[PDB]
Design a protein around this motif. Structure first.
Motif, PDB file in Angstrom:
ATOM      1  N   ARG A 126       0.757  -1.257   0.000  1.00  0.00           N
ATOM      2  CA  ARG A 126       0.000   0.000   0.000  1.00  0.00           C
ATOM      3  C   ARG A 126       0.790   1.312   0.000  1.00  0.00           C
ATOM      4  NH1 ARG A 126      -4.322  -1.410   1.648  1.00  0.00           N
ATOM      5  NH2 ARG A 126      -6.100  -0.245   0.812  1.00  0.00           N
ATOM      6  N   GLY A 127       2.055   1.316   0.423  1.00  0.00           N
ATOM      7  CA  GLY A 127       2.776   2.577   0.520  1.00  0.00           C
ATOM      8  C   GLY A 127       4.195   2.476   0.010  1.00  0.00           C
ATOM      9  N   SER A 128       4.406   1.762  -1.092  1.00  0.00           N
ATOM     10  CA  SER A 128       5.750   1.426  -1.539  1.00  0.00           C
ATOM     11  C   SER A 128       6.171   2.029  -2.878  1.00  0.00           C
ATOM     12  CB  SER A 128       5.893  -0.100  -1.594  1.00  0.00           C
ATOM     13  OG  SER A 128       4.912  -0.679  -2.429  1.00  0.00           O
ATOM     14  N   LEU A 129       5.295   2.746  -3.589  1.00  0.00           N
ATOM     15  CA  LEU A 129       5.729   3.533  -4.738  1.00  0.00           C
ATOM     16  C   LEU A 129       6.154   4.920  -4.263  1.00  0.00           C
ATOM     17  CD1 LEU A 129       3.179   2.849  -7.726  1.00  0.00           C
ATOM     18  CD2 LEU A 129       5.135   1.516  -7.052  1.00  0.00           C
ATOM     19  N   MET A 130       7.216   5.452  -4.876  1.00  0.00           N
ATOM     20  CA  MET A 130       7.898   6.636  -4.354  1.00  0.00           C
ATOM     21  C   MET A 130       7.076   7.910  -4.465  1.00  0.00           C
ATOM     22  SD  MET A 130      10.772   5.640  -3.001  1.00  0.00           S
ATOM     23  CE  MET A 130      10.881   7.338  -2.457  1.00  0.00           C
ATOM     24  N   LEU A 131       5.986   7.899  -5.225  1.00  0.00           N
ATOM     25  CA  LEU A 131       5.058   9.016  -5.261  1.00  0.00           C
ATOM     26  C   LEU A 131       3.666   8.411  -5.273  1.00  0.00           C
ATOM     27  CD1 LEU A 131       7.794   9.967  -7.149  1.00  0.00           C
ATOM     28  CD2 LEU A 131       6.522  12.093  -7.040  1.00  0.00           C
ATOM     29  N   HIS A 132       2.651   9.274  -5.147  1.00  0.00           N
ATOM     30  CA  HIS A 132       1.234   8.913  -5.073  1.00  0.00           C
ATOM     31  C   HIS A 132       1.017   7.624  -4.264  1.00  0.00           C
ATOM     32  CE1 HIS A 132       2.520   6.999  -8.927  1.00  0.00           C
ATOM     33  NE2 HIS A 132       3.021   8.204  -9.127  1.00  0.00           N
ATOM     34  N   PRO A 133       1.416   7.611  -2.977  1.00  0.00           N
ATOM     35  CA  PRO A 133       1.182   6.443  -2.119  1.00  0.00           C
ATOM     36  C   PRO A 133      -0.289   6.287  -1.795  1.00  0.00           C
ATOM     37  CG  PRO A 133       1.951   8.250  -0.793  1.00  0.00           C
ATOM     38  CD  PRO A 133       2.035   8.716  -2.225  1.00  0.00           C
ATOM     39  N   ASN A 134      -0.622   5.337  -0.918  1.00  0.00           N
ATOM     40  CA  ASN A 134      -1.980   4.814  -0.818  1.00  0.00           C
ATOM     41  C   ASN A 134      -2.383   4.220  -2.169  1.00  0.00           C
ATOM     42  OD1 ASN A 134      -4.427   4.118   0.376  1.00  0.00           O
ATOM     43  ND2 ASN A 134      -5.212   6.223   0.493  1.00  0.00           N
ATOM     44  N   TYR A 135      -1.459   3.436  -2.709  1.00  0.00           N
ATOM     45  CA  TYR A 135      -1.569   2.658  -3.927  1.00  0.00           C
ATOM     46  C   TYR A 135      -1.111   1.243  -3.591  1.00  0.00           C
ATOM     47  CZ  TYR A 135       0.082   0.700  -8.360  1.00  0.00           C
ATOM     48  OH  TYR A 135       0.329  -0.122  -9.410  1.00  0.00           O
ATOM     49  N   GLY A 136      -1.831   0.219  -4.047  1.00  0.00           N
ATOM     50  CA  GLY A 136      -1.535  -1.158  -3.687  1.00  0.00           C
ATOM     51  C   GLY A 136      -2.535  -1.733  -2.700  1.00  0.00           C
ATOM     52  N   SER A 137      -2.066  -2.732  -1.949  1.00  0.00           N
ATOM     53  CA  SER A 137      -2.921  -3.556  -1.102  1.00  0.00           C
ATOM     54  C   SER A 137      -2.189  -3.933   0.178  1.00  0.00           C
ATOM     55  CB  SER A 137      -3.328  -4.838  -1.832  1.00  0.00           C
ATOM     56  OG  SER A 137      -2.155  -5.612  -2.047  1.00  0.00           O
ATOM     57  N   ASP A 138      -2.959  -4.356   1.186  1.00  0.00           N
ATOM     58  CA  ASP A 138      -2.408  -4.982   2.381  1.00  0.00           C
ATOM     59  C   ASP A 138      -2.426  -6.509   2.297  1.00  0.00           C
ATOM     60  OD1 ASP A 138      -2.422  -2.331   3.098  1.00  0.00           O
ATOM     61  OD2 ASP A 138      -3.376  -2.642   5.052  1.00  0.00           O
ATOM     62  N   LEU A 139      -2.344  -7.063   1.084  1.00  0.00           N
ATOM     63  CA  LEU A 139      -2.357  -8.512   0.914  1.00  0.00           C
ATOM     64  C   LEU A 139      -1.172  -9.172   1.606  1.00  0.00           C
ATOM     65  CD1 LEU A 139      -4.385 -10.356  -0.694  1.00  0.00           C
ATOM     66  CD2 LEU A 139      -2.590 -10.489  -2.362  1.00  0.00           C
ATOM     67  N   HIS A 140      -0.055  -8.455   1.722  1.00  0.00           N
ATOM     68  CA  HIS A 140       1.110  -8.958   2.444  1.00  0.00           C
ATOM     69  C   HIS A 140       0.893  -8.996   3.952  1.00  0.00           C
ATOM     70  CE1 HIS A 140       1.391  -4.661   2.802  1.00  0.00           C
ATOM     71  NE2 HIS A 140       2.386  -4.759   3.661  1.00  0.00           N
ATOM     72  N   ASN A 141      -0.196  -8.404   4.442  1.00  0.00           N
ATOM     73  CA  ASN A 141      -0.465  -8.249   5.864  1.00  0.00           C
ATOM     74  C   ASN A 141      -1.581  -9.162   6.368  1.00  0.00           C
ATOM     75  OD1 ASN A 141      -0.420  -7.141   8.466  1.00  0.00           O
ATOM     76  ND2 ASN A 141      -1.800  -5.464   7.901  1.00  0.00           N
ATOM     77  N   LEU A 142      -2.318  -9.799   5.456  1.00  0.00           N
ATOM     78  CA  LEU A 142      -3.554 -10.508   5.762  1.00  0.00           C
ATOM     79  C   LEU A 142      -3.352 -12.000   6.018  1.00  0.00           C
ATOM     80  CD1 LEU A 142      -5.908  -8.749   3.194  1.00  0.00           C
ATOM     81  CD2 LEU A 142      -6.152  -8.657   5.678  1.00  0.00           C
ATOM     82  N   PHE A 143      -2.113 -12.486   6.063  1.00  0.00           N
ATOM     83  CA  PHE A 143      -1.870 -13.894   6.353  1.00  0.00           C
ATOM     84  C   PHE A 143      -2.314 -14.250   7.769  1.00  0.00           C
ATOM     85  CE2 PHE A 143       1.187 -13.025   2.905  1.00  0.00           C
ATOM     86  CZ  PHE A 143       0.730 -13.899   1.984  1.00  0.00           C
TER      87      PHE A 143
END
Lengths: 238, 212, 538, 48, 69, 212
Positions: free
Chosen positions: F145-162
């Motif tokens: 969710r916060g790993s592109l260097m601009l315009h964050p709040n992009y992506g998912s928490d799929l890495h967190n839902l295990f």
């Protein structure tokens, strides 16, 4: 018909506009527990100092409200085996979809079409401001209940008001007006200025459905079409 | 628009005007609408022989305007022409395309059905009044709703309706018929008299209030 | 055939009781009853004259009420028009003189070796042609022997088709029986020739013939290599061509032969019958109630009156309404009443005029006003009266006025009264008195009271019958009869079929072989005198 | 021209097989009689 | 208006009647003419009786078929 | 934007405009979009062989603008010549980084997984149209969710839902995936059609409604 010993019971079904055109046609598998219909009148009463005055303006918007429970045990369907919970969810989703798409003032398509398969009567209806209230209390844990209120637009026997095909005999789109306007567009600015002068002069001298047959309303259109093929003054008149 | 009347025994001319307008004094206008001479009504039918068109007798038909067109000279003029044919002005005249009702009733909803035809000799068949109204309901209802190449929402959805023979579907056919028929201003309203579901034949019969 | 939809703009009609009319009219097969449920059906069963103008009047004499279903009979022994021309008996389905206008002819076409049939009749605008009569199917042989033929032999006992045989030279290639077998419909021949190697056979495209195979004609050894010759069967093809349609039928005496377009003969309505009772006998079990004969003759009025009394004695109540002549005098009327003073009959004086829906300002005799009246009276609910109801008559050829409308009515003759305005047609009918002499008793005297009695009585009869006359057991004495009858009377009061009844004024007596009953009822009938008084306190 | 000439596709016509009003194609209203109703004329006309 | 022998039929269907026909053609169905034409023709007749006038003399010269201009 | 359509047996160009836009009058501007010569729709293909690019015949596609773009001259010019290149331009073109399709589906929610590739010759691979969407969705879904260097709040928490594979965790994963997919305005809705469990393995599938 109701269960009267002569015919078996038949149960309510509601037709919805399909979003691709045409319809969906939903039906209930257990009928309503309460059924109420209101018919309010627009009559008003005012009390004058020496008499009472009764005034009426005609029929007011009817209200339809009924309440019931979806059955528990599974029941076969005309294209599946759907349980009561699936039926209730389908109903909620139809209703949600019909309400949400109405964000342009009013749907250009159908209102909901209602068939009273129980007592012979048919209506066109719209979601009332009470809406689809769904609840499930402690009593009867495995039975859903639904409460629906509607307002009647008109009988299903009668087609839409604006859509009625009028008589339209003769010609509603006369060519005289069209070719007059084309002529006057084609005229030169000085020509139109002189036409305005002649119109003003005539107005000074005042003092001091269309059919070519058996009608006088289109008299001016035939005269207005003239005074351009014939040079009655540098420009037409009227 | 108008109403018909039938002259009764020794019927007082003023009684007509009173009976349909409440005041007596509009009989001057009514007799002008019907192009009568001073003998407005007469008992003996032999007296009509002398001036048939300008003299009415018992059992003859008169034309009653509605109140709004009472004093309109143009309506008086037109109502002096269309005597006992005035229906034709409301329902109209149109070309006949029902060449054989023995043909299209056995083929139903399809392309390539109706056609122009000729009654008598030389003059192309023009079908008029109530017989125009028959055609203009029949030809409308057989057309599918989307069909015609200008002014869509003509026609009916009837061709969609060949579903399962069960009662709800029969009422759906009633509804589309009612919807289609009340769609033209020449009919006030419609309602179902009866219906009959055979094993694969729908039969049902409907009333319509044609005007006049 | 295929799925489809249909819309008929039905011209039909442009309810409990039944109405019976016997009169003179010039169409319809004689001496059989018909039930008419639709005016547009009457214009097609019949054609012209009083019986039809009577029906066109009966179903229109009031703008809101109208008569029920009508039973009809024609009072003529009309022959059908026919002729023997050629080898054919031609007989027309129409009975009467009108059928003489029919024309039939036959001509043979060279381009198809068949007949062409034409039938013409004027008043129905009927003029159509049937062609290629015969030609039922063709054969062509295809083997390469020199010249092959076929043959079709009759049953010499009956002139019916017996075999169809194929011959290549002298050898019978194949054969089929035609006196019934496998080949009773021609369809199986149309396979069983084609399926062989050396022959093929095919149908004409003009409609499905598929005749019964016994109807072919005798032919022997017809070449079908140089030609694709027809099998003919000329007579039996006429049924497939014309049987279901039109006005004419054909029957065989012999060889069918062409002839010129010729008229028929013998269509004759005949003399009117000297008596009506023999045909009046047929209404005895058709379920009527009100009957009117369409004639002023006094013999017919006496026969119908005696017939109605004979039916009433046999469990079927009936009532007759009769008129007489064109504008009869008092002396004539009281002469007809005195000769016919029995109950269940009512006599009408006036002769009116009606605007018949053709636009036809018909001046109409008295026995036809009786139709207009009887029609209205028949259509109303049981127990209502014609008393003070209006009739849609146009004008009257009449003598009788207010003082005469004491004299005639007091002597039991009905008449129509002129009221100058607002009441729909200016005309209302004064009373429902019958032709019976003594007016004191209302059941005999006044029609409506009788008409309510007759059906109430029948119901008491029918309900007592299966409860008691069935004789299910004697162990059900007279006390139970009082229980059943009071229950029965309690229903009639509740259902408004009687005004009221006293329950504790019922007497029953019994002897095991017969029970006797006594009961009182308070009847329901139209008001006829209204005496409303005024007082004031000044 | 009632009771007289109408013209053929051929002036070489010499034998008139059939002359007829049509109920439909070949299906004959009247087949006419040669020298009585029509005759051949001109080798070029059916002639009434 | 109709020529002789055109009806050939009666609507009342009484089988005694053999044939029907109008012996003479109907020609009494006169058309409707407004009084304007009548008044015009009357005025023209009244003006043609003038004597010793230029226009009347000119009109009178028109009676001969060969006198045009 | 636009709707796809195909030429039917003896359908006239008038009929199409009337059915979709209501008024028949609009066909005139509608032919310019499909760049048609006068015989705008013609039944026969051997007649299309006359000059193939400037006509449509039975079975050929057609383009149908939305009514707002009907009157735009730029939409007319672009739709005239681009033809099938519409879809590609309308849903986009970019570089293909799904070089190792077998591989990125072995290590998702780990970095360094995607890579440029080569198609054709001497040029980096590119993806277009629907596959442009398959690429971006698959990458976006597999990005935290916060790993592109601009315009964050992009992506998912799929890495967190295990979690313990109890159903509440499965509904949580469903909702995250649906939120993920519905983020791009180009996609109308998503909905689940199946979720399924195999011990320590989740499995399920989602249906997405892409705009025409």
């Amino acid at each position: 018909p109701q269960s009267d010993g002569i015919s078996n019971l038949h149960r309510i079904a509601l037709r919805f506009p399909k979003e691709g055109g045409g319809y969906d046609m939903y039906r209930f598998k257990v009928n309503p527990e309460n059924y109420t219909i209101d018919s309010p009148q627009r009559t008003t009463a005012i009390k004058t100092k020496s008499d009472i005055v009764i005034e009426d303006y005609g029929k007011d918007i009817e209200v339809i409200n009924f309440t019931g429970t979806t059955g528990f045990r599974p029941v076969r369907e005309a294209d599946g085996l759907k349980t009561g919970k699936q039926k209730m969810e389908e109903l909620q989703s139809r209703v949600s979809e019909y309400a949400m798409q109405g964000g342009s003032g009013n749907v250009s398509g159908s209102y909901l079409q209602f068939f009273n398969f129980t007592d012979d009567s048919y209506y066109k209806v719209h979601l009332a401001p009470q809406g689809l209230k769904i609840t499930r209390s402690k009593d009867e844990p495995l039975l859903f209940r639904y409460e629906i209120t509607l307002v009647v637009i008109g009988s299903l026997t009668e087609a839409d008001r604006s859509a009625v095909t009028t008589e339209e005999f003769g010609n509603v789109k006369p060519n005289a007006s069209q070719r007059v306007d084309e002529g006057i567009k084609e005229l030169d600015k000085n020509a139109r200025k002189t036409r305005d002068r002649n119109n003003q002069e005539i107005s000074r001298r005042e003092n001091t459905i269309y059919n070519p047959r058996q009608s006088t309303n289109g008299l001016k259109g035939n005269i207005d079409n003239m005074a351009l093929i014939i040079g009655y003054g540098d420009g037409g008149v009227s | 628009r108008f109403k018909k009347h039938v002259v009764q025994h020794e019927e007082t001319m003023q009684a007509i005007a009173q009976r349909y307008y409440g005041d007596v004094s509009y009989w001057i206008d009514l007799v002008e609408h019907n192009n009568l001479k001073y003998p407005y009504l007469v008992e003996t039918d032999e007296e009509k022989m002398k001036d048939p068109e300008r003299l009415a007798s018992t059992g003859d038909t008169l034309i009653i305007p509605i109140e709004s067109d009472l004093t309109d000279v143009s309506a008086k003029e037109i109502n002096s022409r269309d005597k006992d044919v005035l229906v034709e002005l409301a329902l109209g005249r149109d070309l006949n395309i029902t060449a054989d009702e023995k043909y299209f009733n056995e083929h139903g909803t399809s392309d390539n059905i109706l056609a122009f035809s000729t009654n008598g000799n030389g003059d192309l068949d023009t079908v008029k009044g109530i017989d125009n109204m028959k055609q203009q309901l029949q030809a409308r209802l057989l057309t599918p709703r989307g069909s015609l190449m200008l002014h869509p929402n003509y026609g009916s959805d009837l061709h969609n309706l060949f579903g399962l023979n069960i009662p709800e579907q029969a009422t759906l056919i009633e509804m589309e018929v009612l919807r289609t028929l009340t769609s033209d201003n020449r009919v006030k309203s419609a309602n179902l008299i009866d219906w009959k579901i055979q094993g694969n034949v729908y039969s049902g019969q409907f009333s319509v209030e044609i005007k006049s | 055939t295929r799925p489809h939809a249909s819309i008929e703009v039905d011209t039909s009609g442009i309810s409990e009781k039944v109405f019976c009319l016997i009169g003179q009219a010039e169409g319809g097969e004689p001496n059989t009853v018909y039930e008419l449920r639709n005016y547009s059906q009457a214009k097609r069963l019949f054609r012209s004259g009083e019986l039809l103008d009577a029906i066109e009047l009966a179903w229109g004499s009031n703008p809101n009420y109208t008569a029920g279903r009508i039973l009809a009979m024609r009072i003529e022994d009309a022959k059908p028009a026919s002729a023997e021309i050629g080898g054919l008996k031609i007989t027309s389905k129409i009975y009467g003189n009108v059928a003489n206008n029919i024309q039939v002819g036959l001509e043979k076409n060279t381009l198809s070796d068949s007949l062409r049939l034409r039938v013409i009749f004027q008043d129905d605008r009927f003029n159509e042609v049937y062609d290629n009569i015969g030609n039922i199917f063709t054969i062509k042989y295809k083997g390469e022997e020199a010249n092959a033929t076929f043959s079709v032999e009759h049953d010499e006992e009956t002139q019916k088709a017996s075999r169809l045989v194929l011959k290549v030279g002298d050898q019978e290639v194949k054969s089929y029986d035609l006196t019934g077998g496998a080949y009773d419909y021609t369809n199986a021949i149309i396979t069983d020739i084609n399926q062989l190697p050396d022959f093929e056979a095919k149908l004409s495209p003009f409609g499905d013939k598929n005749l019964e195979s016994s109807k072919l004609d005798k032919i022997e050894n017809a070449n079908i290599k140089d030609k694709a010759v027809y099998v003919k069967a000329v007579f039996g093809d006429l049924e497939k061509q014309t049987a279901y349609n039109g006005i004419v039928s054909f029957e065989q005496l012999k060889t069918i032969e062409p002839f010129e377009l010729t008229k028929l003969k013998g269509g004759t309505n005949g003399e009117p019958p000297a008596t009506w009772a023999d045909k009046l006998d047929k209404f005895a079990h058709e379920g009527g109630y009100y009957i009117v004969p369409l004639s002023s003759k006094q013999s017919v009025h006496a026969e119908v009156a005696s017939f109605v009394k004979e039916r009433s004695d046999a469990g079927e109540p009936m009532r007759a309404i009769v008129g007489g002549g064109f504008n009869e005098s008092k002396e004539q009327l009281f002469g007809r009443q005195a000769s016919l003073s029995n109950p269940r009959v009512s006599l009408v004086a006036n002769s009116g005029t009606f605007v018949m829906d053709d636009g036809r300002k018909n001046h109409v005799p008295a026995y036809m006003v009786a139709v207009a009246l009887g029609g209205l009276a028949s259509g109303l609910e049981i127990g209502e009266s014609i008393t003070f109801k209006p009739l849609r008559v146009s004008s009257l050829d009449q003598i009788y006025e207010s003082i005469d409308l004491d004299e005639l009515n007091e002597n039991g003759i009905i008449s129509i009264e002129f009221v100058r305005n607002r009441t729909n047609t200016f005309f209302r009918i004064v009373d429902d008195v019958t032709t019976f002499n003594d007016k004191s008793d209302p059941v005999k005297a006044e029609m409506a009271v009788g008409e309510a009695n007759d059906f109430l009585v029948s119901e008491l009869k029918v309900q007592l019958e299966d409860q008691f006359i069935g004789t299910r057991t004697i162990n059900t004495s007279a006390s139970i009869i009082k229980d059943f009858i009071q229950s029965y009377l309690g229903r009639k009061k509740r259902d408004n079929e009687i005004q009221d009844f006293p329950a504790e004024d019922v007497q029953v007596i019994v002897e095991g072989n017969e029970a006797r009953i006594s009961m009182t009822v308070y009847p329901i009938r139209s008001f006829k005198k209204i005496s409303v008084s005024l007082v004031y306190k000044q | 021209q009632g009771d007289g000439q109408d013209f053929l596709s051929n002036n070489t016509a010499f034998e008139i097989v059939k002359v007829w009003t049509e109920t439909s194609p070949g299906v004959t209203t009247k087949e006419y009689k040669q020298g009585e109703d029509f005759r051949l004329t001109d080798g070029q006309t059916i002639d009434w | 208006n109709v020529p002789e022998g055109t009806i050939n039929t009666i609507a009342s269907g009484s089988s005694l009647i053999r044939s029907v026909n109008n012996e003479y053609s109907f020609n009494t169905g006169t058309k409707e003419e407004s009084q304007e034409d009548f008044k015009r023709r009357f005025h023209s007749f009244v003006e043609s009786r003038g004597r010793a006038t230029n226009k009347s003399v000119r009109y009178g010269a028109l009676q001969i078929p060969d006198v045009e201009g």
